[PDB]
Amino acid sequence: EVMLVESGGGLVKPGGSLKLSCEASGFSFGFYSLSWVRQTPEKRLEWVATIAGSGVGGQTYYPDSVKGRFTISRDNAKNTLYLQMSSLRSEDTAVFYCARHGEGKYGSNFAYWGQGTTLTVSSASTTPPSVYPLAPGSAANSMVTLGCLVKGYFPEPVTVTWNSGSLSSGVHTFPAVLQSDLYTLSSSVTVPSSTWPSETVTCNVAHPASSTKVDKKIVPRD
Amino acid sequence: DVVLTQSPATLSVTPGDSVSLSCRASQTISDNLHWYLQKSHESPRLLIKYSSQSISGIPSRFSGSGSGTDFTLNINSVETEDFGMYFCQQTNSWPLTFGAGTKLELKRTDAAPTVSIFPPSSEQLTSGGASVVCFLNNFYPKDINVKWKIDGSERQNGVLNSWTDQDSKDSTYSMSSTLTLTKDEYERHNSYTCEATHKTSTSPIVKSFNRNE
Amino acid sequence: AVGLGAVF
């Protein structure tokens, strides 16, 4: 099996530098051309850099948007592809994929893609979330919907579970919305009315960037 | 640079239908045009290379054609596992460029939303803010309108909405809508309402609470 | 046409 495994992504301030790696296996590494391609938060795919294979000429290629800032290189003995990025920009923020090209005359396409590593470039401050319970109005069915509001955090991601994973069906975690440089998301869970409030329902929120975990038990309002 | 224009941007189809996705190049690119499918939470996957060449492991229902500037990806009898984003990409000249993608979404029977409204938490109020949250869950089709009302009067400012991706189990959509006010404004009014309009009902679904309850 | 295909 062709394996391409990227690493190195992280949160960097603008003007900073970061090196990505892609470890490959399952094919004769040195013969193939390899590229980096990124996917922006808008889901656009953008080619970032290419290094040609051994019978292709070995040269490097870059779009104007990264020329002078990024350097692609390879260590064939290690089966590893590198991307050294410098002078980073907020517009560089993306999931970065390593990709392997094909063979022969009909082989300039991307044939295989990695799993991606995430780069976020921002001058906004890392900010932990506030976690607020969503319980129905005191005056409000066989099923009850509860939730948690996770407000004012940066950067993405946060993860939300319910009762440490024992409530899995009936959960919706909504995509975060950005405003004034902070994210807010919500999560809903729907359970039988006989299970709440007689049994506890807790949202477990994790924000790794700020080393934060919050457990918020949802209690009925007065 | 070669600009690739993909049409349509989004398309909903019932499994078993057939589709034709268009990719048009701003200048001629011979047959140097490739197609990828990216499913949710996954990396892109090569479907067709050099306009029409098949890829081992890809089902025969995928077919490509075209040369010059106008290219087509046919999917004949779309299967559940085929829904996702379809990108084209050219290798005729540097820089390598991609189309913006066609999102193929699954058409199913209509489903009305389950609507729930939630008051600000006392925790949030201690911080000077007040968010009122409305969940509109498991509906189809995706088009829906939410109107917020305070004491029965429409409010447009301070609303933020978020839609989920199409559900992997039941192919419905869900939306969350949050109205954020100051605590002092929140406490100057009585009732808060979210009104959902959806093609499944002539009348909107109304959910409210008030602060005298 | 950019000619990136592997040759052996």
Question: Read out DSSP for A8-50?
Answer: ---EE-TT--EEEEEEEESS-GGGS-EEEEEE-TT--EEEEEE
Q: How many CB pairs under 8 A join B and C?
A: 11
Give the Cβ contact number of residue B47 at 10 Å.
21
Pick left, alpha or beta for residue A87 (phi over 0 → left; psi -120 to 50 → alpha; otherwise beta).
left
H/E segment holding residue A211:
none
Closest CA to B130 of B155, B162, B153: B155
- Provide the terminal-to-terminal Cα distance of chain C, rounded to the nearest Å: 18
The answer to whether B94 contacts C2, with C-beta atoms less than 8 Å apart, is: yes
What would the DSSP string read from start to end of B14-26? -TT--EEEEEEES
**C residues 1-8 lying closer than 8 A (beta carbon) to B:** 1-2, 4
DSSP A163: G
Rounded-to-integer distance, Cα B92 and Cα B96, Å: 8
* Residue in this structure with the two tokens 């953008």, named with its chain if needed: A46
Which of B131, B135, B175 is closest, CB to CB, to A145?
B135
H/E segment holding residue B125:
helix B122-125
Q: How far is B38 from chain C (nearest CA, A)?
A: 23
| Integer-rounded Cα radius of gyration of chain C | 6
**Do strands A94-101 and A80-85 pair parallel, antiparallel, or not at all (unpaired)?**
unpaired
A217: its two tokens:
């038990």
Closest CA to A155 of A117, A124, A118: A124
* Residue in this structure with the two tokens 């290690």, named with its chain if needed: A78
Closest CA to A147 of B21, B126, B155, B120: B120
Cis check: omega of the bond before A192, within 30 degrees of 0: no
Give the Cβ contact number of residue A91 at 10 Å.
11
B113: its two tokens:
């939303």
Q: Phi and psi dihedrals of B171, rounded to 5?
A: 65, 20
Query: Which domains, from first to last, does chain A contain?
Result: 3-121 (2.60.40.10), 130-218 (2.60.40.10)
Residues of A in contact with B32 (CB under 8 A): 108
Rounded-to-integer distance, Cα A88 and Cα C7, Å: 35
How deeply is A222 buried, as exposed, middle or buried, from its count of CB atoms within 10 A (0-12, 13-18, 19+)? exposed
DSSP A75: E
All residues at 6 or more sequence positions from B122 whose CB lies less than 8 Å from its CB, including other chains: none
Rounded-to-integer distance, Cα A160 and Cα A205, Å: 5
Q: How far is B94 from chain C (nearest CA, A)?
A: 7
Rounded-to-integer distance, Cα A159 and Cα A153, Å: 12
- Provide the terminal-to-terminal Cα distance of chain A, rounded to the nearest Å: 59
**Torsion of the alpha carbons at B155, B138, A215 and A202, rounded to the nearest 10:** 110
Residues of B in contact with A63 (CB under 8 A): 94-96
Q: How far is C1 from chain B (nearest CA, A)?
A: 5
Could you tell me which chains touch chain C, where touching means 3 or more CB pairs under 8 A? A, B
Rounded-to-integer distance, Cα B128 and Cα B25, Å: 53
Closest CA to A130 of B72, B33, B205, B129: B129
Which residue type sits at A98? C
H/E segment holding residue B124:
helix B122-125
The answer to whether C1 contacts B93, with C-beta atoms less than 8 Å apart, is: yes
3-state secondary structure of B105: strand
Residues of A in contact with B49 (CB under 8 A): 102, 106, 109
How deeply is A157 buried, as exposed, middle or buried, from its count of CB atoms within 10 A (0-12, 13-18, 19+)? middle
Rounded-to-integer distance, Cα C5 and Cα B32, Å: 13
Rounded-to-integer distance, Cα A167 and Cα A58, Å: 53
Rounded-to-integer distance, Cα B194 and Cα B145, Å: 10
Q: Phi and psi dihedrals of B122, rounded to 5?
A: -60, -30
- The strand pairing partners of B90, in sequence order, are B33, B97
Q: How far is C2 from chain B (nearest CA, A)?
A: 6
- Taking the Cβ of residue B124 and every Cβ of chain C, the question of whether any pair is shorter than 8 Å is answered with no
Rounded-to-integer distance, Cα A147 and Cα A57, Å: 57
How deeply is B191 buried, as exposed, middle or buried, from its count of CB atoms within 10 A (0-12, 13-18, 19+)? middle
Residues of C in contact with A107 (CB under 8 A): 4-6
Choosing among B43, B163, B210, which should be mutated to test the A contact, i.e. which has the most A CBs within 10 A? B43
- Taking the Cβ of residue B91 and every Cβ of chain C, the question of whether any pair is shorter than 8 Å is answered with yes
Three state DSSP letters for A81-148: EEEEECCCCHHHCEEEEEEEECECCCCCCEEEECCCEEEEECCCCCECCEEEEECCCCCCCCEEEEEE
The answer to whether A104 contacts C7, with C-beta atoms less than 8 Å apart, is: yes
The answer to whether C2 contacts B93, with C-beta atoms less than 8 Å apart, is: yes
Give the Cβ contact number of residue A12 at 10 Å.
17
The answer to whether A45 contacts B32, with C-beta atoms less than 8 Å apart, is: no
**Do strands A60-61 and A202-207 pair parallel, antiparallel, or not at all (unpaired)?**
unpaired
The answer to whether B164 contacts A108, with C-beta atoms less than 8 Å apart, is: no
Contact of A200 with A215, CB cutoff 8 Å: no
Dihedral over Cα of A187, A178, A153, B187: its sign: negative
Q: How many CB pairs under 8 A join A and B?
A: 124
All residues at 6 or more sequence positions from A199 whose CB lies less than 8 Å from its CB, including other chains: none
* Residue in this structure with the two tokens 């052996």, named with its chain if needed: C8
Choosing among A186, A187, A222, which should be mutated to test the B contact, i.e. which has the most B CBs within 10 A? A186
A28: its two tokens:
């004769």
Give the Cβ contact number of residue A25 at 10 Å.
11
All residues at 6 or more sequence positions from B151 whose CB lies less than 8 Å from its CB, including other chains: B189, B190, B191
Closest CA to B82 of B21, B4, B7: B21
Contact of A9 with A96, CB cutoff 8 Å: yes
Contact of A45 with A55, CB cutoff 8 Å: no
A63: its two tokens:
């779009």
Query: Which domains, from first to last, does chain B contain?
Result: 4-106 (2.60.40.10), 114-210 (2.60.40.10)
Experimental method: X-ray
How deeply is B108 buried, as exposed, middle or buried, from its count of CB atoms within 10 A (0-12, 13-18, 19+)? middle
The answer to whether A188 contacts B135, with C-beta atoms less than 8 Å apart, is: yes
Residues of C in contact with A49 (CB under 8 A): none
DSSP A167: B
DSSP B9: S
CA distances, B171 to each of A143, A163, A203 (Å): 21, 25, 25
